[PDB]
From a paper:
RGS proteins act as GTPase-activating proteins (GAPs) by interacting directly with activated Gα and accelerating GTP hydrolysis thereby promoting G-protein inactivation upon reassembly of the inactive Gαβγ heterotrimer. A unique hallmark of R7 RGS proteins is their modular architecture encompassing several domains and subunits. The central GGL domain forms an obligatory heterodimer with type 5 G-protein β-subunit (Gβ5) which stabilizes the complex and docks it onto effectors. RGS7 is a prototypic member of the family, broadly expressed in the nervous system and periphery and involved in regulation of multiple GPCR systems with key roles in physiology.
To gain structural insights into the specificity of the RGS7-Gβ5 interaction, we solved the 2.13 Å crystal structure of the RGS7-Gβ5 dimer complex which required buffer optimization using thermofluor. The structure contains all domains common to the R7 RGS family members: DEP-DHEX, GGL and RGS. The core of the molecule is formed by the Gβ5 subunit, which has a typical β-propeller fold commonly found in domains with WD40 repeats. Notably, Gβ5 is engulfed by all RGS7 domains, making extensive contacts at four main interfaces: the DEP domain, the DHEX-GGL linker, the Gγ-like (GGL) domain, and the RGS domain. Electron density is visible for residues 19–218 and 252–450 of chain A as well as 19–218 and 252–450 of chain B of RGS7 and for residues 2–353 of chain C and 4–353 of chain D of Gβ5. Interestingly, in RGS7, the Dα1Dα2 and Eα1Eα2 loops adopt a unique conformation in both molecules within asymmetric unit documenting yet another alternative organization and intrinsic flexibility of this region. In RGS7, the DHEX domain is lifted upward and away from Gβ5 thereby creating a wider groove between DHEX and Gβ5 when compared to RGS9. Most prominently, this includes much longer Eα1Eα2 and DEP-DHEX loops that adopt different conformations. Together, this distinct organization of the Eα1Eα2 and Dα1Dα2 loops positions them close to the invariant Eα3Eα4 loop to assemble a strong cluster of basic residues on the surface of the DEP-DHEX interface. In RGS7, the DHEX-GGL linker forms a 310-helix embedded into the β-propeller ring at the hotspot region of Gβ5. The present structure shows a unique mode of Gβ5 integration into the complex providing the first example of Gβγ like complexes in which N-terminal α-helices of both Gβ subunit and GGL are protruding away from β-propeller fold of Gβ subunit.
Residue numbers in the entry:
A (entry chain D): 2 to 353
B (entry chain A): 18 to 218, 252 to 450
Write the structure that this text describes.
Amino acid sequence: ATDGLHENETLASLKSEAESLKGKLEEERAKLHDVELHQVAERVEALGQFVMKTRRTLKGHGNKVLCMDWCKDKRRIVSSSQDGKVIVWDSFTTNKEHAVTMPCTWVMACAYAPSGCAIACGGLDNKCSVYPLTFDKNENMAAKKKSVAMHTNYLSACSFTNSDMQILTASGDGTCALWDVESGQLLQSFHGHGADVLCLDLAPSETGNTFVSGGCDKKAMVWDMRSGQCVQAFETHESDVNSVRYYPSGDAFASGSDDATCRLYDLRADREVAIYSKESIIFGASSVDFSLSGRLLFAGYNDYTINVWDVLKGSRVSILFGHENRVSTLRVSPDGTAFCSGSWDHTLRVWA
Amino acid sequence: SPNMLVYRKMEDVIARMQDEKNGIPIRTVKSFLSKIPSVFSGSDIVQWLIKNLTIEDPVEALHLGTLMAAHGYFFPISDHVLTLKDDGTFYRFQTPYFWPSNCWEPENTDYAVYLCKRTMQNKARLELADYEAESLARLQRAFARKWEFIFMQAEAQAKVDKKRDKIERKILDSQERAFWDVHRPVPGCVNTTEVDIKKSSPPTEDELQQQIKYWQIQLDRHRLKMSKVADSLLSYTEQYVEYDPFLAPPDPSNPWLSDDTTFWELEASKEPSQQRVKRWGFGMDEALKDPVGREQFLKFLESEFSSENLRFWLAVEDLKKRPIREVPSRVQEIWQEFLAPGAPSAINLDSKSYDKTTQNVKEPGRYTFEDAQEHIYKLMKSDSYPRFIRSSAYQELLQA
């Protein structure tokens, strides 16, 4: 007409500018998606028959085993359970070396210090505490407890950095946090997850100040430990992300979920590149970890079993039976010679 | 809820098992004493899963079927312990009313009515299992004040079961028993109902402005072709296959298979093996990961009078390993030794990294030298590291 403010004439200009950038990204993502990983991996020769068996059985915990972590010496193992007890084993001989009882139940997280002289653990106490390890006679570990982290909900995962002086923590209050062990100071908080954070894994490149985490919002997020910001996020699972683990090169990571699938995301491709699943696998995956070369992905499921996946070709190369309840934690040895699974059946098993 | 997701998947399987054309045949067999209606054998379940789910290993199919039984979708008619056997044991489907997905967290007051009703059956001559009788004794002690009304409630249910179709009564009695075999399992059996403690819980002008900045940030990300990404993953993994103990047997043996720890002592020796030295050549990260590779890398650079870049990088990495109490004084020591004008081990940064670091030192922190370390790392990756790999020192280690 001759009047009219015509706000929509400029809103349509902004809508045609936001639509074009979105279509620009959709067309670029499709242009880069020229092949599938398993199609390229047809060039690779298939793996031979596997004969992995249980080599050690760690019996001692009084309730569900909830977490475990290898020591850098390739044989010692820290493990935590629902009854509140944390145990340090010499898994090669199965001898218990250290043990501490915590003031809470459901100690869902434990970790081994890079020096091998301390451990961190926590759970329903909404904290993460560092305990020293000594060769002391009648050693009283609880009297040396260092309270480091502190959240408003349960602790779901923890991990030392490249030294004994900092720990990462993931909590059910939707946050990850970096802490100074000596002082208990909060170095950085990581806000972004829309629900409980269930897991985390530090970047393999000790030069890299990044880590990945997974939560009940079906998302996996890569963080910058300097800025505290989420620099990359992935959402393709149909349920909770229970475990995340970096591919050995650091350019990719895998995840296990309650949707009975394991997926591989590549940070350079900025998309999920592989899905590890099968019609007969309907229980959720609780933990995942890679072999040394990254060719194999080990996963522990709530069906009491362990499924080993060819990371490149996608096919399942083994299924391992033994546990009589859920497999709650699974980690490959620091030298890749074995892997250890912890279960709700109160035991841990070392396989090779 | 995540616990519901596996129920729907199990219930989908039960839906396929009950198909008319390609389902499990449900028969009414007879024994020497009685006739048993609407049953099927365990081998029928195992062979159905093998065929219709394409499971090659029968142990895997038997294991999948044993978890469906434990969760209460089919049950053995002759055992309170819910499991599956690959033989002629007779099983019976659970009615969808007693399914675990049907909002079931039954109370002890409901179990007391059930156990009380059971002792009335068979002209009050039914004998509960030992664990059931011990459960009833605890419930009678707990609900001792209101026991007259639990008895009346169970006596009222028994009158309905008495005037009930004999064949339907036989099937429903076992189905109600199988329901309580899930929620009050036999001692020693996994309680499938136990759950993880984690899981037991403006104008439209600024809106378009929020979108445009969102999508533009996504376009700024540098991505790679899937062909290039797949090529780098395939070549990186193939590089370490000879080092993967799950794929190639370790020298001399895997300590977990042979109980011989000589492999661990060789890996920790200060004299490296040829494969260990060869691994340093895969990239600078491998040389820096290996403590012997780090020593030999540094030892070479000091012999060529060019170690300042690596010693600075090693100093910053140690800085991020220090407690936050020590980092302000340590930042000044790194600045004085490597970056300040007239420094003993002066490194050469670009003007952008040097200006940023000069301002970062004014307020020290753990990441004061990140922009500089990033630059020095790429510099060694293209200069100092190729010099080490090409040195006669490395070549004499690589050839033993």
